[PDB]
Amino acid sequence: RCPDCGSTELVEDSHYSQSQLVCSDCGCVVTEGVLTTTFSDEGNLREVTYSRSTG
């Protein structure tokens, strides 16, 4: 629910490059910005089976 107008019409939307969650009835921004891993670490991914990780 939008904290400013209480309406439930929140829509996930991204501008040119900015991801954000916007109340589609009053224009308020409730949450903006994301933190994502990049290629530099994408090359290092290993695997551990969960059964192994659980003993």
């Binding site: 490059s17 994502t36 990049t38 290629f39 530099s40």
Partner: protein, 49 residues
């Protein structure tokens, strides 16, 4: 982030830093390298350091 596949952001390399030092502009490279990259706020205890 780094690439154009992901949305990018160009780099202020180690040589542009020296160019900006050469100009003698002290607030501009502060604005370029802290205000608009990763300005973060922490809290520090002076009793233990």
């Amino acid at each position: 982030t780094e690439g154009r596949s992901r949305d990018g952001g160009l780099r202020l390399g180690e040589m542009e830093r020296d160019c900006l030092i050469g100009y003698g502009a002290s607030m501009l490279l502060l604005e370029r390298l802290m205000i608009s990259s990763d300005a973060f706020e922490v809290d520090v205890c002076g009793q233990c350091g």
